[PDB]
Amino acid sequence: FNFQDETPTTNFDTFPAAILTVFQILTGEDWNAVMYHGIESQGGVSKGM
Amino acid sequence: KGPDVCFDNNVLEDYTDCG
Amino acid sequence: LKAVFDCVVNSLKNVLNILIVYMLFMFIFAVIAVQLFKGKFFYCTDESKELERDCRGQYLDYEKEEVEAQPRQWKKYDFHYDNVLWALLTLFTVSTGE
Amino acid sequence: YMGKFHKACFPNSTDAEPVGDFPCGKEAPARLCEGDTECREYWPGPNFG
Amino acid sequence: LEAEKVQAAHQWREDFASNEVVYYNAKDDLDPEKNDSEPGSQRIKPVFIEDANFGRQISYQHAAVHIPTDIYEGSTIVLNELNWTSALDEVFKKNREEDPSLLWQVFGSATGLARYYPASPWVDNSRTPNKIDLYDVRRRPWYIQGAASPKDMLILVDVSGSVSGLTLKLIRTSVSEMLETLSDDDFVNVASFNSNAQDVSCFQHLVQANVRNKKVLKDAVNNITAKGITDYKKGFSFAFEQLLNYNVSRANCNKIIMLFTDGGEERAQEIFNKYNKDKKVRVFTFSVGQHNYDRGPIQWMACENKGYYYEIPSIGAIRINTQEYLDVLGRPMVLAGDKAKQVQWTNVYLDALELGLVITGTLPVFNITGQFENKTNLKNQLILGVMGVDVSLEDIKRLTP
Amino acid sequence: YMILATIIANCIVLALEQHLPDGDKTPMSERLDDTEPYFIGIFCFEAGI
Amino acid sequence: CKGKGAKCSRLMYDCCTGSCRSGKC
Amino acid sequence: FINLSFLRLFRAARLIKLLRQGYTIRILLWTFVQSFKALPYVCLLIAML
Ligand SMILES: *[C@@H]1O[C@H](CO)[C@@H](O[C@@H]2O[C@H](CO)[C@@H](O[C@@H]3O[C@H](CO)[C@@H](O)[C@H](O)[C@@H]3O)[C@H](O)[C@H]2NC(C)=O)[C@H](O)[C@H]1NC(C)=O
Ligand SMILES: CCCCCCCCCCCCCCCC
Ligand SMILES: CCCCCCCCCCCCCCCC
Ligand SMILES: *[C@@H]1O[C@H](CO)[C@@H](O)[C@H](O)[C@H]1NC(C)=O
Ligand SMILES: *[C@@H]1O[C@H](CO)[C@@H](O)[C@H](O)[C@H]1NC(C)=O
Ligand SMILES: *[C@@H]1O[C@H](CO)[C@@H](O)[C@H](O)[C@H]1NC(C)=O
Ligand SMILES: [Ca+2]
Ligand SMILES: [Ca+2]
Numbered sequence A: 001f002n003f004q005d006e007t008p009t010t011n012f013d014t015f016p017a018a019i020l021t022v023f024q025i026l027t028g029e030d031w032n033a034v035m036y037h038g039i040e041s042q043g044g045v046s047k048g049m
Numbered sequence B: 001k002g003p004d005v006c007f008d009n010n011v012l013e014d015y016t017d018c019g
Numbered sequence C: 001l002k003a004v005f006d007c008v009v010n011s012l013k014n015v016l017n018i019l020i021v022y023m024l025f026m027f028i029f030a031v032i033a034v035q036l037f038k039g040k041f042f043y044c045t046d047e048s049k050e051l052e053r054d055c056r057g058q059y060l061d062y063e064k065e066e067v068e069a070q071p072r073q074w075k076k077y078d079f080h081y082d083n084v085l086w087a088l089l090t091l092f093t094v095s096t097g098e
Numbered sequence D: 001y002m003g004k005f006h007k008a009c010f011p012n013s014t015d016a017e018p019v020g021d022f023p024c025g026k027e028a029p030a031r032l033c034e035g036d037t038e039c040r041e042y043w044p045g046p047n048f049g
Numbered sequence E: 001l002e003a004e005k006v007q008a009a010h011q012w013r014e015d016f017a018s019n020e021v022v023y024y025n026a027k028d029d030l031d032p033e034k035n036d037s038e039p040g041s042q043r044i045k046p047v048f049i050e051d052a053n054f055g056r057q058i059s060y061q062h063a064a065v066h067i068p069t070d071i072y073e074g075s076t077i078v079l080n081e082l083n084w085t086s087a088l089d090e091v092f093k094k095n096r097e098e099d100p101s102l103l104w105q106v107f108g109s110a111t112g113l114a115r116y117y118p119a120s121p122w123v124d125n126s127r128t129p130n131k132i133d134l135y136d137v138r139r140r141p142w143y144i145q146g147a148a149s150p151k152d153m154l155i156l157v158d159v160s161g162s163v164s165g166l167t168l169k170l171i172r173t174s175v176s177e178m179l180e181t182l183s184d185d186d187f188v189n190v191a192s193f194n195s196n197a198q199d200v201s202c203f204q205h206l207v208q209a210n211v212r213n214k215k216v217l218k219d220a221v222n223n224i225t226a227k228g229i230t231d232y233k234k235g236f237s238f239a240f241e242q243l244l245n246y247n248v249s250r251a252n253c254n255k256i257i258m259l260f261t262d263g264g265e266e267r268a269q270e271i272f273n274k275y276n277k278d279k280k281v282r283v284f285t286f287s288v289g290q291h292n293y294d295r296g297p298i299q300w301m302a303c304e305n306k307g308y309y310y311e312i313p314s315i316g317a318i319r320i321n322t323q324e325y326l327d328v329l330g331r332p333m334v335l336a337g338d339k340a341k342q343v344q345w346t347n348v349y350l351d352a353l354e355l356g357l358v359i360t361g362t363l364p365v366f367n368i369t370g371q372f373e374n375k376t377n378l379k380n381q382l383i384l385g386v387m388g389v390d391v392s393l394e395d396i397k398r399l400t401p
Numbered sequence F: 001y002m003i004l005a006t007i008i009a010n011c012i013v014l015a016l017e018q019h020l021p022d023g024d025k026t027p028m029s030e031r032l033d034d035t036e037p038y039f040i041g042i043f044c045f046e047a048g049i
Numbered sequence G: 001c002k003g004k005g006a007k008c009s010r011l012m013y014d015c016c017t018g019s020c021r022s023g024k025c
Numbered sequence H: 001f002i003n004l005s006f007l008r009l010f011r012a013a014r015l016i017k018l019l020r021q022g023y024t025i026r027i028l029l030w031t032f033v034q035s036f037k038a039l040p041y042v043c044l045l046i047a048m049l
Helices: A015-026 A031-041 C002-014 C016-037 C084-095 E002-008 E076-084 E086-098 E141-146 E166-179 E211-222 E232-242 E269-275 E296-304 E318-329 E331-335 E393-397 F002-015 F027-034 F036-048 H006-013 H016-021 H023-037 H040-048
Strands: C042-044 C058-061 C068-071 C074-076 E021-025 E041-043 E105-109 E155-157 E190-193 E197-199 E256-261 E282-288 E308-312 E357-366 E383-392
Touching: A015 A031, C002 C016, C002 H040, C016 C084, E002 E086, E002 E357, E002 E383, E021 E076, E076 E086, E086 E105, E141 E357, E141 E383, E155 E166, E155 E232, E166 E211, E166 E256, E166 E282, E166 E318, E190 E211, E190 E232, E197 E232, E232 E256, E232 E269, E256 E296, E256 E318, E282 E296, E282 E318, E296 E308, E308 E318, E318 E331, E357 E393, E383 E393, F002 F036, F027 F036, H016 H023
Parallel strands: E021 E041, E155 E190, E155 E256, E256 E282, E282 E308
Antiparallel strands: C042 C074, C058 C068, E105 E383, E190 E197, E357 E383
16 A cells, blocks of 8 residues: 555554554445555556456 | 864763764 | 424434433543543644644645745644543544544 | 546646546536646546546 | 853843844845734844945844744744854954955854844845745755764665655655765765665765765665665675775765664664674664654664664655754764864855855854863753855955956 | 464464565564464364364 | 645545545645 | 436336346335335425424
8 A cells, every 4th residue: 555655544554554444444434545545556447446 | 185184983972862 | 294293203202311321421432532632633734843832933845846835833633622522523523434 | 427537627738647636528517627728538537547 | 262152151041022132034024014023032124235245235233144944933942042143243243344355254053043244135035935945054065064074974775665655755855865965075875775785876885975976876866666675784784894995085084874764673783793893883873754663773773883863754854854963973073172173165166145156164163061160061062053254266366366 | 272272373473464565574574474384284183183 | 734735645634624635635 | 408318318227127027126125115105204304304
């Protein structure tokens, strides 16, 4: 998640950060923003979808 | 030709200010 | 429509004994949130000054494709637990998830 | 809604990135460019496309 | 002499409302605005005549003051400096009175201020859109020159995997701004390590820090990418080996290592104990970035190697920390009381308050509060500032008919 | 109970791993990857039993 | 803390006094 | 016209034949929709709010 020139608060690097990101997706707040960031992290709309 | 006199490595210098 | 309103009010009376428990539990949570975060939700316009003394004057803003001297302001966050009423509003916005 | 998010406010003859992350259009009810910019043919879209 | 004497007899304060400090701020608009005053300072409004020597508005009645935008002009440090520099103002008057040919003569304070005698408005950056004032006296070549002795840097950049993204941006900008504080008497190379240490550029040793070499190093640092696992031992081995090269031209003085990392759990005690045991080489460690890595070994390398530890969380913190290692390097110069007070002239440069080509003669000012009445002498190892006086190059041209 | 103990230890070892952007590795990651064959052996041992 | 109108990322949440909408605070 | 090309909805609306084909989902939807149509003043209360 470091492609944006800065790592988000909701990253999957450490385990506390990953568990907080998963909890925030469970609460359903900005899960789409994390989805966009995870699609771009794996390529982009071209191949990371 | 570089400068002749320069000041470094004093023994009275207090290094306990690592900030 | 009066019958539907009466049904809604009857439901509100049915859940009124759990609304009081809900409000009490959210009140303990709001007071704990105050004690945790009372006065700590302050910031400068520049992320390098950590006090209100240091937060006066101007600073270089490297965020508009051109540097500019923006003023240094010791502002507060929008939802900030600085109070039991503010903590209740902040925790309500948290509970709705937004 | 197929392909309608790709026309963004692009500068003049600069071949640069668009201003604003919003779609635009030249028609009547759509959002029009302002400040001497044009709705060009491709911009990947909002939320990275 | 007067600056040292009048700072020795200064009493620290925290209240200036009861006793205002009266001074002319260079970046004051000419409008008669009664509401442009700070709580603790009353601003002078001067009468500006046009002078042939300077080509600007010049007031001989008082000295002007320049305070950078990023520095608040009413804090305690700034207000105390503005209080005790009035004797400097008077000696400015005396100097110009005994020699009417003097150009800008200035006290470059280590708090950020700058107090030059002929009161003239700042160049174009008082209050003008798109004309931002980035001037800082402590980056100026004459201040860099008079604040310490010639360096032998070696910037270790930590281009490993964990520095990708914002950290690498801040590291390359920080290395550029660090190189921009090296004169032509200073020798520098830039190395970079990720499980293997290498030169970032075509240079294989310490090269002189002139404009061309500094540009080459800057291009190499800008062209650098982050990948791989860190190794603090193979990097400091490279640094200490390149500082042991005596086949090349050098300034045999002030050996330094600048470590631009983020953080880690590796202290490398044995590398230091092997290469730096007499502690001839300093190590300044910079923890660049906004992250949550361990910063203990980084702060320990600076302690056990006479260095200092700086943090650069974001662009905007870059400018201040370079001035600060140079603040550290001047401790041995202070302790040499009067053998270190010698006049030095800088390379030909273009004056800020535009005068053309000038050379500046610098002399550092020492903090002498506790002296011969010895006290704890907490920060008596740092210079107060540097005094400079400009000599016009067209003034030298008139002595060669 | 010892199988549950190894499973819990494996969960802690997985929660102790931290990922770095471009091939970088935390020094503890090598230890947490050298502790893998123990868990593999114990799991294959119970599988064989 | 990014000021109003500054270019931001949604997931950064460093958008004091507002939120990162369409890449701008 | 504003309604120049709304006619494309009919080809997509032909899909409801498979909704008819789906037995238990058809009974479920019919049950819940006929319950909704029997509750018009609840929706009137929400609309008045
Ligand atoms: C030159 O060195 C002298 C001393 O070596 C510096 O003076 C000392 O400055 C410190 C501040 O760093 C003063 O401590 C302060 O005292 C006030 C009032 O007591 C207190 O409110 C502060 O919290 C802080 O403790 C100290 O009193 C002062 N004098 C002495 C004798 O130590 C001086 O600042 C140095 N020059 C410059 C330009 O900084
Ligand atoms: C479930 C109840 C939560 C709703 C709380 C709303 C509070 C609205 C007011 C908050 C700010 C007022 C505080 C004034 C203090 C000077
Ligand atoms: C008194 C609160 C009114 C507003 C709350 C609406 C949202 C509540 C739904 C909970 C969202 C989390 C995901 C679903 C799991 C319960
Ligand atoms: C410092 O401030 C005091 C009170 O305003 C003043 O009397 C004194 O002259 C000032 N120091 C100098 C060197 O002018
Ligand atoms: C320098 O830049 C060129 C062009 O972008 C690139 O091919 C080369 O790899 C860069 N140097 C290094 C050491 O990566
Ligand atoms: C310097 O020269 C000597 C002899 O010419 C050689 O042995 C050595 O490898 C050279 N380099 C260094 C870094 O000493
Ligand atoms: Ca939402
Ligand atoms: Ca690393």
